Amino acid sequence: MASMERFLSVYDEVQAFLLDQLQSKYEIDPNRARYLRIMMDTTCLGGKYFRGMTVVNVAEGFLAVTQHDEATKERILHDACVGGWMIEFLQAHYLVEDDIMDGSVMRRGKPCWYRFPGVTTQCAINDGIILKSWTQIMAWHYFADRPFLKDLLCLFQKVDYATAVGQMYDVTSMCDSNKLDPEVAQPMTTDFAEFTPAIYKRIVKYKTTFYTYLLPLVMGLLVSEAAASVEMNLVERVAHLIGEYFQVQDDVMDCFTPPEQLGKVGTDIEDAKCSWLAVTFLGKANAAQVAEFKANYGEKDPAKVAVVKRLYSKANLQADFAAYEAEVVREVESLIEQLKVKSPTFAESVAVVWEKTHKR
Amino acid sequence: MASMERFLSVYDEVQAFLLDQLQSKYEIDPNRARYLRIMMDTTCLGGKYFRGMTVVNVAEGFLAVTQHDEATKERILHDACVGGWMIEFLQAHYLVEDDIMDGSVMRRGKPCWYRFPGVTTQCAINDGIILKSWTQIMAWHYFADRPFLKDLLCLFQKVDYATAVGQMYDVTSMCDSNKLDPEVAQPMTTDFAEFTPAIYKRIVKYKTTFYTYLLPLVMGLLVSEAAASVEMNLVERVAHLIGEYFQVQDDVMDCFTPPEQLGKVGTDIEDAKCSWLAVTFLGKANAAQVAEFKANYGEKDPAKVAVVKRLYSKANLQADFAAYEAEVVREVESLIEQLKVKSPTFAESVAVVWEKTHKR
Ligand SMILES: O=[N+]([O-])c1ccc(O)c(O)c1
Ligand SMILES: O=[N+]([O-])c1ccc(O)c(O)c1
Ligand SMILES: [Zn+2]
Ligand SMILES: [Zn+2]
Ligand SMILES: [Zn+2]
Numbered sequence: 001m002a003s004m005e006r007f008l009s010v011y012d013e014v015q016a017f018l019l020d021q022l023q024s025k026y027e028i029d030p031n032r033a034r035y036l037r038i039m040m041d042t043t044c045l046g047g048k049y050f051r052g053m054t055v056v057n058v059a060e061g062f063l064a065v066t067q068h069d070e071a072t073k074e075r076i077l078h079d080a081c082v083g084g085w086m087i088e089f090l091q092a093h094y095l096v097e098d099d100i101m102d103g104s105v106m107r108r109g110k111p112c113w114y115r116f117p118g119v120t121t122q123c124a125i126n127d128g129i130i131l132k133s134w135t136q137i138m139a140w141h142y143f144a145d146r147p148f149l150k151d152l153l154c155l156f157q158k159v160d161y162a163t164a165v166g167q168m169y170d171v172t173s174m175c176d177s178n179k180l181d182p183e184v185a186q187p188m189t190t191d192f193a194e195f196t197p198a199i200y201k202r203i204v205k206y207k208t209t210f211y212t213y214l215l216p217l218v219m220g221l222l223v224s225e226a227a228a229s230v231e232m233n234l235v236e237r238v239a240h241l242i243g244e245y246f247q248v249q250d251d252v253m254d255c256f257t258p259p260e261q262l263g264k265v266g267t268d269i270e271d272a273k274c275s276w277l278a279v280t281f282l283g284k285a286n287a288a289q290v291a292e293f294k295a296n297y298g299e300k301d302p303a304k305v306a307v308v309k310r311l312y313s314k315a316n317l318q319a320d321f322a323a324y325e326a327e328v329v330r331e332v333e334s335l336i337e338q339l340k341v342k343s344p345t346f347a348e349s350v351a352v353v354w355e356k357t358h359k360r
Numbered sequence: 361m362a363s364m365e366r367f368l369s370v371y372d373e374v375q376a377f378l379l380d381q382l383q384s385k386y387e388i389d390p391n392r393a394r395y396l397r398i399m400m401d402t403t404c405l406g407g408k409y410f411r412g413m414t415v416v417n418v419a420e421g422f423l424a425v426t427q428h429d430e431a432t433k434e435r436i437l438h439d440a441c442v443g444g445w446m447i448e449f450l451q452a453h454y455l456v457e458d459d460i461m462d463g464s465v466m467r468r469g470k471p472c473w474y475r476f477p478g479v480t481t482q483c484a485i486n487d488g489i490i491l492k493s494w495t496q497i498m499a500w501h502y503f504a505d506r507p508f509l510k511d512l513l514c515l516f517q518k519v520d521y522a523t524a525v526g527q528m529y530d531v532t533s534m535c536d537s538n539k540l541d542p543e544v545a546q547p548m549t550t551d552f553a554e555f556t557p558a559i560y561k562r563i564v565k566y567k568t569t570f571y572t573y574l575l576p577l578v579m580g581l582l583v584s585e586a587a588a589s590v591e592m593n594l595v596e597r598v599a600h601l602i603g604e605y606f607q608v609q610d611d612v613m614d615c616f617t618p619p620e621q622l623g624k625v626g627t628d629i630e631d632a633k634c635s636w637l638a639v640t641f642l643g644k645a646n647a648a649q650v651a652e653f654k655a656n657y658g659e660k661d662p663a664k665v666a667v668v669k670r671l672y673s674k675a676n677l678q679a680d681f682a683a684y685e686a687e688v689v690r691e692v693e694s695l696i697e698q699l700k701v702k703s704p705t706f707a708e709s710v711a712v713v714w715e716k717t718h719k720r
């Protein structure tokens with residue numbers, strides 16, 4: 001059975017289980033079951049499923065080199081699909097809540113969930129909470145008797161926590177750290193001293209690399225009972241490296257990819273985000289360029305946004321991206337080589353992950 | 361050591377552990393650690409700790425009748441305190457998010473967290489997510505080697521899920537179920553046909569009784585390794601009965617308790633909530649009273665709110681409350697008697713819980 005079709009079949013199965021359990025154990029009525037079904041479909045479906053399918057692909061790699069009964073192969077692949085959906089539902093939680101937090105308008109060419117006429121923020125915040133709860137409900141049901149249950153739940157909650165910490169790093173990245181204070185309304189930085197590579201790297205590491213790359217890779221190992229087959233420190237290093245590249249590409253697209261292609265209007269400049277573009281620009285700018293950036297960044301005024309995009313264009317940041325890209329290619333190939341010492345199979349799965357990311 | 365002082369000492373310990381771990385494993389800086397410390401204190405402290413202290417009191421009851429080394433007594437009580445704080449932090453999550461969802465202004469005489477000048481909704485939604493994550497971080501750290509870890513985490517996530525489902529039941533309780541639809545803006549009911557005792561009971565059961573009574577009672581049993589000492593179906597029944605009474609009292613106070621005493625301005629009438637008052641009023645009203653209720657309920661207009669409160673006053677609902685109260689006293693005393701068959705000690709702990717609730 002083709003992997004994507006298996007993955008989609010398991011979505012339907014998990015959805016039916018969750019809604020049936022709501023009827024049999026939580027007294028739900030058919031109309032609220034329908035609302036939650038539509039909520040699940042709208043918030044969890046329609047992406048590329050890169051994260052969930054990484055779990056499946058990692059598990060497929062180990063099946064090709066490991067002796068198993070056919071029923072065991074089917075169990076492992078089903079487990080990989082359920083685990084992949086746990087990650088997709090975790091992402092769905094964060095996208096629902098982040099879109100509310102950020103006042104976002106569209107996602108993937110459609111309105112953000114909270115903007116649906118019959119949803120509203122009052123419902124959508126709680127819908128996002130339900131999405132997160134569903135990750136645990138499906139784990140306890142499908143993995144109840146599994147040897148990896150404890151490790152998988154512990155990993156999942158650490159990654160969830162890392163992601164929330166990273167969200168804090170992101171939403172505070174345009175303020176001066178020493179002025180953070182719940183009692184005092186937060187001004188945007190004026191010196192941009194905290195727009196540095198190391199501070200940028202911390203935001204990205206926590207807000208997206210743990211749930212986008214580390215969690216799918218390690219979940220694939222766990223459902224395969226293969227974690228002792230790899231050097232975990234290398235798994236972490238390569239997950240954080242590929243994940244940073246993924247976010248850098250996202251940052252570039254926010255500014256330069258046409259909205260029809262991007263699926264939304266990017267507002268990182270108006271929002272004063274600590275983006276790869278801003279950090280790289282400030283790392284190469286002269287005094288006059290820095291002053292012009294300061295006079296225009298973080299402002300809704302379209303003329304000021306246009307000034308910032310021209311500064312980026314004139315600074316030839318596409319060439320800095322090519323140099324960054326070349327160094328990532330070099331470092332990821334090195335880590336893949338090291339992963340071969342203990343597992344050529346897992347190294348190949350990571351090579352596939354990188355190629356997909358690189359060619360996005 | 362007095363129970364409350366132990367409980368507060370464990371708060372300080374858990375807080376220090378969480379913040380130290382953020383520094384050593386999540387790359388946090390001192391200013392963001394300070395923000396999160398203040399967030400934790402502001403959102404988790406200042407209530408009565410009824411829920412957390414129930415865990416401790418249940419465990420204390422079993423210690424009095426069970427043979428243990430002194431070090432084991434100390435371990436059990438420390439575990440009970442950590443488990444109690446898990447429940448308090450879970451509540452804190454829901455109060456932060458519910459206050460945002462509902463546009464609430466005050467809680468306990470102070471501004472809701474999202475309204476702090478240096479917080480804002482953008483940060484507060486994520487702060488609430490962190491509060492929930494902390495419940496799991498503290499469980500995995502303190503209970504890693506404990507025999508009850510699996511049962512405790514499974515129970516906790518079921519109760520968390522029930523609570524979110526109950527929040528859905530609550531925030532949709534003024535709409536007609538058959539018209540729920542993410543695509544269509546939701547009108548308030550005009551017939552109030554779903555303002556019934558059974559529908560009210562479902563809201564309350566899920567939105568507050570699981571986390572306010574069932575979870576603290578069962579967590580106390582789990583940390584005491586005493587769950588086989590009780591009839592779990594009776595624990596559930598008595599938790600749901602006491603928890604309903606607790607919410608009925610809250611509903612009455614929303615309407616009739618002065619804001620200075622209540623800690624907020626109650627708006628259940630303007631919000632068109634399915635409250636015990638509205639359900640009881642509609643269960644005894646004549647046609648003219650029903651029509652007057654319909655013409656005034658769910659409206660911000662203070663004159664219309666005043667009409668509704670007068671309808672309630674003239675309907676002598678205080679007497680319906682006394683009758684409801686008398687039946688609850690009768691039913692709770694019956695369940696306590698049944699709990700004595702297997703555990704007089706646990707029955708007494710439940711009797712204490714009821715007395716505290718009744719005399720609130
Ligand atoms: O962007 N990609 O290609 C991705 C993103 C996340 C992944 O886990 C992955 O394996 C590929
Ligand atoms: O209101 N009370 O007194 C309460 C509320 C919750 C509890 O778990 C409790 O033991 C007492
Ligand atoms: Zn965001
Ligand atoms: Zn972006
Ligand atoms: Zn509410």
Ligand SMILES: [Zn+2]
Pocket residue numbers: 610611614
């Ligand atoms: Zn209330």
